[PDB]
């Protein structure tokens, strides 16, 4: 039946007995693509019956559906014209892993971050209302995403529309790990009272409410969804789904199966089984030790403990000293700041792309008060996650231009661990550390253990004519540029490990004027608002020439990394070529 | 006077109920004098008198810790914790800021100005206590308006998991700055109308314990409630109903006006300087009321600060469904605007520079990744305006201009501003932000471009040589003056440029200047790091062009003297000219 689904109209042609068979067909096809190609396993298997019912009852694209995150919209794409991308291995990559309007009229937003569906959906509804449309507007949002303040604001506003607004809460009792927040006790009393409970968070927020206990039964959902169709006021449809339904291993281990690398369908084991530790593992190793020796130390995550190497066992080990605040980046920062104000030693670890949510809290809650909380920022690089919503391109311009902030850029493992140890020990600054997005590199030479004199860059090779400031993960690159500059142009360049993203070594920059005419900067991130521009500004009235290397200010999506680097001149021979072109 | 003998909460605990009530009276008298003479947040502090007395009657600050949301309503806190003379003697009026400040007092635990952060910062204090085995009480005080902000939701959500002492005072006076907005406020009405007994309780749904206090301006009732929860061993909400501006008739009848007053006549309520003339907020209101009438797809959005758009309660009435107030939810305001523009609407979101700082990810992902043509109006961006540390409008350029796909415009005069806003509404190709000039309303006097679709065209306004001046936005006048004095003092005829586009560089014009110029300077009204000027420096980095960038340093300042600060950053005509000559010779 699935081979003949080209739009929601074809879904409406089926009998209910046929809808159930289609559910099976979808799961078979998902099992193949997801085991071969990786992806969000649990969220999509759990969403099968609700997506069929959604496109059975509603008339997309007049009616519009918005998924929170969109990591769970595979079945949506499967039923709106993109099935061939899931049935034929040769076409696995013809769709992104998130919603995309360029692919389909059935997709209204590129979405990857959490708790944004409800807000964007109310945008659609208000737009309808101002222009006299009459379509249904649906947001689909996970129970974990409910912990984000943007979703609270969206619900708050939705309760005021006075018009059609449909909010499907997909309650599978799981975020990535387990949920956290007192709200989840409310969700729970409601499931147990079959939606009957008087004290209802959603009703307290001003909204109407209905509950569906069998979130994996096409009939129940069609029933539910038909009841709310063409409704004229805001309503919540709270449904209970079983995360990863239809695949035993997923049902028994929900955290592991939220996202899988390619694996064996029969055993569930990954296809490539060797792994060497990454900086996440290291970091978990360090904090479990420190937290044992020093009861003031507390590790914090916003719904992504794995970014800190914190398996369910390790969380258990850490007990009261490991905190998961839900998907609430804003709060994580203010919490860290208050902890540090009343004698605790907080360490908040977060992805670069997600820390984008907390600019004002970093600035006001944290830095105005100058509290010594520690922030670890992971995966900041131009060569990592490469879909547009998860681009870790912007943390240097996000963070490094805030007053009072100290942002450190380690280049190797012992240095990373030394700044982190010093971070916890000091009491004078908020400290953020850009965890290197590389394999774990051994420093091989003893490293400074005190970073209290700010903005001292470390010369690692005395040279002349050209100086290279190779920041963080791009130290390796500065090293290769040094070699190739020597072998092809016989320039012996000064190589510099800057360490401090948040300031300029004025005195060294001055000393370089003597035996150098060109300084270049390499940074693993976008150029606008980043580190290199400060160097350009410092030399602006002097006879020192400067080149800045990094990523251009532009969105890119599922790109080839070799290209993107070359396109931005981030290769050793492109850099040396540019130097000589400037020198002569 | 009892108030002259208060140096700490210990002194507050000495009084009887009759003396506490007399003390309430003295505080209001003293407040009326300070606020009518010196201005300030009138309504919120008059509403908080009895609750602040009771707090320091029952709790033992600074061992116990109190955190005020925003802290605009912490004047009585200061009056009862040792800083009373800053409220009794006019000569010392300025010896305290209008917000909490730890440098002033150990009774102050955070510098706080923005909304909905108390609960989160307070839970931090509690978690820290818990990690070190303290046993002090931890209190957050939050207004009903601040509850509409998502940080407050996350904080409550987290607090409900502590399993330890946590006291959250909700000061419900049924007002934000204007009236509240959000469905949650209907549940608050239910709770107040049922004297806290209603089954449907938002606070209990969040995992929290709860009690209600119907007379939030009665010392006895508050002492009562606060004593019951003292040393409680789990998180609790104490929901109290206060009358905004209690004790002063004119404020009680107009709560929106008296949220904040310039100095005024205690007897008439009239401002001491009553002449008012049109500013860009007023201009903006006029434009949007016209367009919204002519074009039914236009909708104006505020995040609880409608005055920033000149939107008096009448004007809101007029605009009806076409004027939207989303509460204090800056983040949501952006995503709403983006969804509106995706479904045939034309949204115009107006916001203060200092507050738009909340929405970086929403600007980036909700708005700019999808490239939706929502319009953003960013007010008060300047180094010469609001000058307390938490309300510094220094950072909107580095916050916004480095987001990909964003078009961010800097008008220099009034006709240009409106022409830029008209085009913004008409185009369908870009998200557009407009940095409303933080100057007097200046008439352009020469006809202005009406189409801004070809991006990154800087407008040469005077052809010269040797030195070129890129004077962005509010600093166009300053660039005009640097040109004059350069001409009068060094006999250089400098090229003057109005750049307009903050978000890009005129490659072509920048290249042509290399012919008849050796120096380029940039002037911007904001912090330099991540700002406009650095893109010019970077562009010329490999050329023989020299560049200077003028703006504010990356540094926090608080209640500063503005002339001083300008001089310190070389932001004067005589300092810029001097630096130019110092580079040339
Ligand atoms: C802003 C932001 N913060 C954090 C994340 C991390 N994240 C990606 S998917 C996901 C799961 C969301 O949980 P829920 O909505 O309950 O869905 P489920 O996995 O249970 O289907 C999370 C936390 C994100 N994508 N964006
Ligand atoms: C982030 C942010 N957005 C907006 C404001 C504007 N603002 C300043 S004071 C205030 C009033 C808050 O109202 P409420 O919390 O109910 O207190 P009340 O004035 O009624 O005592 C507002 C909206 C702000 N300070 N910070
Ligand atoms: Mg979930
Ligand atoms: Mg209020």
UniProtKB/TrEMBL annotation, chain A:
Disulfide bridge positions per record: 412-443
Keyword check for Oxidoreductase: no
Subunit comment: Homodimer.
Protein name in UniProt: 1-deoxy-D-xylulose-5-phosphate synthase
Cofactor(s) the protein needs: Mg(2+)
Taxonomy, superkingdom: Bacteria
GO molecular-function term, one example from the UniProt record: metal ion binding
Keyword Repeat: no
GO biological process entries: isopentenyl diphosphate biosynthetic process, methylerythritol 4-phosphate pathway; terpenoid biosynthetic process; thiamine biosynthetic process
Family: Belongs to the transketolase family. DXPS subfamily.
Organism: Bacteroides ovatus
Keywords: Isoprene biosynthesis, Magnesium, Metal-binding, Thiamine biosynthesis, Thiamine pyrophosphate, Transferase
Known EC number: 2.2.1.7
């Amino acid at each position: 039946y699935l081979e003949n689904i080209y739009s929601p109209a074809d879904v409406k042609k089926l009998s209910v007995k046929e809808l159930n068979e289609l559910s099976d067909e979808i799961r078979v096809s998902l099992l193949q693509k997801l085991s071969e190609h990786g992806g969000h396993f649990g969220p999509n298997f759990g969403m099968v019956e609700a997506t069929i019912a959604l496109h059975y009852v509603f008339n997309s694209p007049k009616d519009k559906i918005v998924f929170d995150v969109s990591h769970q919209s595979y079945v949506h794409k499967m039923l709106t014209g993109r099935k061939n991308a899931f049935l034929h291995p040769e076409e696995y990559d013809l769709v992104s892993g998130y919603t995309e309007p360029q692919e389909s009229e059935h997709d209204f937003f590129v979405i990857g971050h959490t708790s944004t569906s409800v807000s964007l959906a109310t945008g659609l509804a208000k737009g309808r209302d101002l222009t006299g449309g009459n379509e249904n507007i649906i947001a689909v949002i996970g129970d974990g995403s409910l912990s984000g303040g943007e979703a609270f604001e969206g619900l708050d506003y939705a309760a005021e529309l006075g018009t059609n607004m449909i909010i499907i809460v997909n309650d599978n009792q799981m975020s990535i790990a387990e949920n956290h927040g007192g709200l989840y006790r409310n969700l729970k009393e409601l499931r147990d009272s079959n939606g009957q409970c008087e004290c209802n968070f959603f009703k307290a927020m001003g909204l109407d409410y209905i509950y569906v206990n069998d979130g994996n039964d096409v009939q129940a959902l069609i029933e539910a969804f038909s009841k709310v169709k063409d409704i004229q006021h805001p309503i919540v449809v709270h449904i209970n789904t079983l995360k990863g339904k239809g695949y035993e291993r997923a049902e028994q281990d929900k955290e592991t199966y939220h996202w899988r690398t390619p694996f064996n369908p029969e055993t569930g084991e990954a296809k490539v089984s060797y792994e060497e530790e990454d900086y996440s593992e290291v970091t978990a190793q360090y904090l479990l030790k420190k937290m044992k020796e020093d009861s003031r130390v507390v590790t914090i995550t916003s719904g992504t403990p794995a970014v800190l190497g914190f398996t369910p066992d390790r969380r258990k080990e850490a007990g009261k000293q490991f905190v998961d605040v839900g998907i609430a980046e804003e709060h994580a920062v203010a919490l860290a700041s208050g902890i540090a104000a009343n004698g605790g030693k907080p360490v908040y670890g977060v992805y670069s792309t997600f820390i984008q949510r907390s600019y004002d809290q970093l600035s006001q809650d944290l830095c105005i008060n100058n509290n010594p909380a520690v922030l670890l920022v992971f995966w900041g690089t131009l060569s990592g996650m490469n879909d547009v919503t998860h681009l870790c391109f912007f943390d240097i311009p996000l963070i490094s231009n805030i007053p009072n902030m100290v942002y450190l850029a380690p280049t190797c493992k012992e240095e990373y661990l030394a700044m982190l140890e010093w971070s916890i020990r000091q009491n004078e600054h908020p400290v953020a550390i850009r965890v290197p997005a590389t394999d774990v590199i051994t420093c091989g030479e003893p490293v400074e253990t005190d970073y209290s004199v700010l903005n001292r860059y470390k010369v690692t090779h005395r040279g002349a004519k050209v100086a290279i400031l190779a920041l963080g993960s791009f130290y390796g690159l500065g090293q290769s540029v040094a070699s190739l500059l020597k072998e092809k142009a016989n320039i012996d360049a000064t190589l510099i490990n800057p360490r401090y993203i948040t300031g300029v070594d004025n005195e060294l920059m001055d000393e370089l004027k003597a035996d150098h005419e060109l300084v270049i900067t390499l940074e693993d991130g976008v150029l606008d608002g980043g580190f290199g521009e400060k160097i350009a500004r410092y030399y602006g009235a002097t006879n020192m020439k400067v080149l800045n290397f990094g990523a251009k200010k532009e969105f890119v999506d599922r790109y080839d990394i070799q290209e993107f680097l070359r396109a931005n001149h981030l290769t050793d021979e492109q850099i040396v070529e540019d130097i000589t072109a400037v020198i002569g």
